[PDB]
Design an enzyme around this catalytic site. Structure first.
Site, short mmCIF file in Angstrom:
data_model
loop_
_atom_site.label_atom_id
_atom_site.label_comp_id
_atom_site.label_asym_id
_atom_site.label_seq_id
_atom_site.Cartn_x
_atom_site.Cartn_y
_atom_site.Cartn_z
N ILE A 85 0.82 -1.22 0.00
CA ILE A 85 0.00 0.00 0.00
C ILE A 85 0.86 1.28 0.00
CG2 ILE A 85 -1.95 -1.01 1.07
CD1 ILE A 85 -1.12 -0.10 3.58
N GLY A 106 8.73 3.56 0.27
CA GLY A 106 9.65 4.66 0.58
C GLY A 106 11.05 4.08 0.88
N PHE A 116 13.25 3.23 3.34
CA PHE A 116 12.98 1.99 4.12
C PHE A 116 12.52 0.76 3.27
CE2 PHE A 116 9.42 5.14 4.54
CZ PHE A 116 8.34 4.39 3.92
N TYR A 169 -4.37 -0.39 11.02
CA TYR A 169 -4.60 -0.17 9.64
C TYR A 169 -5.60 0.92 9.38
CZ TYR A 169 -5.95 -0.97 4.94
OH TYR A 169 -6.25 -0.81 3.65
N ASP A 199 7.86 15.63 9.54
CA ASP A 199 7.45 15.37 8.20
C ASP A 199 5.92 15.31 8.10
OD1 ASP A 199 7.67 14.84 5.43
OD2 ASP A 199 8.06 12.65 5.81
#
Length: 309
Positions: free
Chosen positions: A23, A26, A28, A96, A140
């Site tokens: 989903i 990035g 990581f 989630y 961020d």
């Protein structure tokens, strides 16, 4: 393994979780929806490889993040549910959500209603006032890192760039949303969690206008700009003065003029009364619209309906 001892569960993730679907990702690596086998609950799983080439930076990040995630306890941050380890991937399990406030603006191709910007803002602000009350900084904040989960709750996510101690000095965040003082600190400087206040400001504009200001310049130029230039504001005339003052408040270019998150929490923008269903109503229009989408199999946005497949 001292830290492996200290921080992970020992079970094997491959036996706990199934039906993984990507989903997001990035630097990581990826984030997946998954089904927890023990209870048929849905979860989010952020896998982070530390195999790469160089495991060192990678592993360090993982552990730093776990230690930070272990510490949160508040309904407006994304809940952490523990982490597992198999074959050089740490798995970080979390609650989630339907999706991010960005996903909202990508699905409707329309900025949200002012009321919905208020509900969204309000929840992220509780989340921020929480971190800040513990000397934490997110660093961020943006629509992308603001998740909605039904019943209807707004939650900060991605603590990948977060700091455990205010004041901080390092150069992180995503350029368009960065605060002047984070940029100046390239050179030899420091900042509060008022930097999240700034980013929340940009996030308001972004929710109001779908894009943050400067979205139309490369990042280095935007950086020179945010810094050396004057500070933006909502562009339309049509938004209440409440909203408008909020943004101009968040957007004080000089920290001592920027209110803290604790203060904004009482601002009239965020207190004006609103339907209690707003978020849950937003969510509902949001799935209706993704279902009214053509060729649902060739949809980026089909993410929003995963729980039902």
């Amino acid at each position: 393994d001292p830290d492996v001892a200290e921080l992970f569960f020992k079970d094997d993730p491959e036996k706990l979780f199934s039906d993984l679907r990507e989903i997001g990702h990035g630097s990581f690596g990826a984030v997946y929806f998954a089904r927890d086998v023990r209870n048929s609950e849905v979860v989010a799983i952020k896998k982070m490889s530390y195999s790469g080439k160089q495991s060192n930076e990678k592993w360090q990040d993982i552990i730093k993040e776990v230690r930070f995630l272990q510490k949160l306890r508040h309904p407006n941050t994304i809940q952490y549910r523990g982490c597992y380890l198999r074959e050089h991937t740490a798995w970080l399990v979390m609650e989630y959500c339907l999706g991010s406030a960005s996903d909202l603006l990508e699905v409707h191709k329309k900025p949200l209603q002012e009321v919905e910007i208020a509900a969204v803002t309000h929840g992220a602000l509780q989340g921020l006032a929480y971190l800040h009350s513990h000397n934490m900084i997110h660093r961020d904040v943006k629509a992308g890192n603001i998740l909605l989960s039904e019943p209807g709750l707004v939650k900060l996510g991605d603590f990948g760039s977060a700091s455990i101690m205010a004041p901080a000095n390092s150069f992180v965040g995503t350029p368009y949303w960065m605060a002047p003082e984070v940029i100046l600190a390239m050179d030899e400087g420091q900042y509060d969690g008022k930097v999240d206040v700034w980013s929340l400001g940009i996030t308001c504009i972004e929710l109001a206008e779908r894009k943050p200001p400067l979205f139309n310049m490369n990042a280095m130029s935007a950086l020179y700009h945010i810094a050396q230039n004057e500070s933006p504001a909502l562009q339309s005339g049509h938004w209440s003065e409440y909203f408008r003052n909020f943004v101009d408040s968040c957007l004080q270019k000089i920290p001592q003029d920027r209110p803290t998150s604790e203060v904004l929490l009482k601002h009239r923008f965020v207190l004006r009364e609103r339907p209690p269903t707003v978020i849950m109503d937003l969510i509902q229009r949001t799935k209706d619209a993704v279902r009214e989408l053509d060729n649902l199999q060739y949809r980026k946005m089909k993410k929003i309906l995963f729980q039902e497949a």
